[PDB]
Design a protein around this nucleic acid. Structure first.
Length: 144
RNA sequence: GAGAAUGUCGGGGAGCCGAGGUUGUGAAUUGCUUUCAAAAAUUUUGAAAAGCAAUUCACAAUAAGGAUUAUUCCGUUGUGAAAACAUUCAAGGCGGGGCAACUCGCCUU
């Protein structure tokens, strides 16, 4: 509500309607909720869906549970604990995931571990590439 | 070297608006010059028009031009022969926001 409707009259109308639907008295609700500095215009590197897929793995403790890991990452977790051979899992993974013997070991993984398990790439590894003729070059300029 | 996170300093692009200036029209006042045009002693005064103006106000335009009736625009950018582009660009659904137009998120190809 705060982030989306950035217009004054619309803002107090949304605030009053929110205070009506939610059983909270619209007496100090709108007075406290009128003076908000507007959110600083900045956006993160990733999107909502990607971070949604990422967070459950690096959760640990009571805030973590196995059911919140999606189908693909659960399958990859089973593959890692099993130790079987997958084309989408590299040898460096097993090198790093030697401690990931049990499903309980998937608690509090760092950014790189969770990112790889979710999407299978050890960060941005680039593509190197190699042009073969003037055709590639002129295409590159055409697409600039 | 790469990724992410937090601060600092810059640059670029797009957008919503404001005040002048200028050119022209009309008007109020006051001038310079010329001609008509009378009076008076080549010269001085008086009526009219034109040319150029000055101070103030209202208005028209503000790249020549071309659309359109959406409370929308394109016209000083780049590429290059196609006088053709780029700078808006799919479909749904599940939602938040308002008097609603409209605006803002989530999910699947």
């Amino acid at each position: 509500i705060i982030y989306s409707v950035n217009d004054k009259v619309e803002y107090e109308k949304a605030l009053k309607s929110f205070a009506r639907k939610h059983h909270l008295d619209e007496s100090s609700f709108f007075e406290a909720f009128r003076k908000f500095p507007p959110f600083k215009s900045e956006y993160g590197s990733f999107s909502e869906k990607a971070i949604k897929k990422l967070l459950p793995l690096m959760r640990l403790g009571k805030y973590w549970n196995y059911a919140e890991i999606d189908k693909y990452s659960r399958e990859r977790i089973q593959k890692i604990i099993t130790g079987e051979y997958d084309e989408n899992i590299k040898d460096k993974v097993r090198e790093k995931s030697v401690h990931l013997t049990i499903e309980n070991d998937f608690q509090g993984l760092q950014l790189w571990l969770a990112q790889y398990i979710v999407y299978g790439r050890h960060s941005e590894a680039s593509m190197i590439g190699k042009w073969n003729s003037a055709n590639d070059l002129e295409v590159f300029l055409k697409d600039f």
